[PDB]
């Protein structure tokens, strides 16, 4: 198949500014490249069909261009509603191969996180499992570093974390880790903690709790 | 089929006028006679 | 109103078959091309195939050749997708689009998209556990151990949405998903106000309204 390579994978930008994406092709596909926008939950939404020809109801700020193997999509001025993923597609040779993806984020003023730590539920212990949760709410940028320390012992490889999408209002993220442990391995230790690091914080903030 | 002023876009699977590509700098080959 | 409602599509084990319907009501379904496209969880799009108006020219994808049969019943204005010998690597959300060029403008209409999850892991409903509270305090509500996705958590049936942040599900080493839903509430609104997280899981057909209050 033909490979469409989209760069950058993530572009941080603020409303009003412009955005220029790229979509490199494995082989000359000529003026036969489309552009699609998709938002979390909704199906894709077409934008350009013949490299530069837009669809109906598509504002003029959306501008496609490029021919052969180097293609781009310019967004002269970003509105709130235009921050989403952007794919590219070729249709000069079946199978129609899509792009990797260029997701835009709304760049905003920094904001330190609000840290919280939740000991494991006493009903989760009846089952046989233990899950210590640490929450980081309303924080920008996305880059953050969360650690666990069971009795000053930095843990590793037993803690998963998942984040939210940018808020409709704040344009802020929210992260949550999960140190999963066994029953006895949890009952065997007393001091659990969550060391959060973020450029919005003067120094790494931590909050602990006994058993 | 399409006209001498139209080309066939395989995505939309329909004949597209050349007038939309005349504003471009690299239209299809058959639009050279039109634009 | 142009509409592309897609019914069918649920859960199946490796090697099973499944038929999907894409009912179209609102536009000339019998006059335009139709196409299918899948998108694996948290991944990019992946074309599948298209089909001529009168079923006189079908186009599939090599990797999925012989795996998916496409048809269309113009009489019922609906597009079908017959699936065969599936695998967990075939899991994704399936849309049914349609692009044409009538009225002098390029159009495009996508369906809601229906999920098809391929796996041998037996269905399971989530296990709800409350996250205890502590000048702003924060409580929560854990949804651990469920399969397949998704689950829909709420807070007070909708009387509390400000400050709610429900994180996406994550597949654990046991092939099970576990997400968490947390809301930030005033520190004083605790011994006065009551907060509940009503969860729902259509696969296992479960619902759990756990109350959250401190010790
Ligand atoms: Cu190839
Ligand atoms: Cu929040």
Author numbering:
A (entry chain L): 1 to 211
B (entry chain A): 7 to 41
C (entry chain H): 1 to 134, 141 to 221
Lines quoted from the article behind this entry:
One of the most attractive targets for both antibody and chimaeric antigen receptor T-cell (CAR-T)-based treatments is the B-cell maturation antigen (BCMA). This cell surface receptor is involved in the survival of long-lived PCs in the bone marrow via interactions with its native soluble ligands APRIL and BAFF. Although a number of monoclonal IgGs have been generated against BCMA, only one has been thoroughly structurally characterized, the chimaeric mouse/human J22.9-xi that showed substantial anti-tumor effects in an MM mouse model.
For the full humanization, identification of the human germline sequences corresponding to the J22.9-xi VH and VL chains was performed using IgBLAST and subsequent sequence alignments indicated a total of 41 residue changes needed to produce fully humanized sequences, 16 in VH and 25 in VL. Several constructs were cloned, and the antibodies were produced in a small scale as described for J22.9-xi. Reversing the change back to alanine restored binding in the absence of any other changes, confirming the original predictions from the modelling. The final humanized variant comprising all substitutions in both the VH and VL, with the exception of A46 in the VL, is hereafter referred to as J22.9-H. The affinity of J22.9-H for human BCMA (hBCMA) was determined by SPR to be (1.5 ± 0.3) × 10−8 M—a nearly 200-fold loss compared to J22.9-xi at (2.8 ± 0.7) × 10−10 M. We solved all three structures by molecular replacement: J22.9-H and J22.9-ISY to 3.1 Å and J22.9-FNY to 2.7 Å, thereby allowing comparison of the binding interaction of the fully humanized and optimized IgGs with that of the original chimaeric and biologically active J22.9-xi. The backbone root mean square deviation (RMSD) of the variable domains between J22.9-xi and J22.9-H is 0.86 Å, indicating no substantial changes in overall architecture. The fully humanized J22.9-H showed a 13.3° difference to J22.9-xi, with an elbow angle of 160.5°; the CDR optimized variants displayed no further change in elbow angle, with J22.9-FNY at 159.4° and J22.9-ISY at 160.4°. The ca. 200-fold loss of binding affinity upon humanization can be explained by a combination of these induced changes and, considering the minimal number of direct contacts between the antibody and BCMA, is not unexpected.
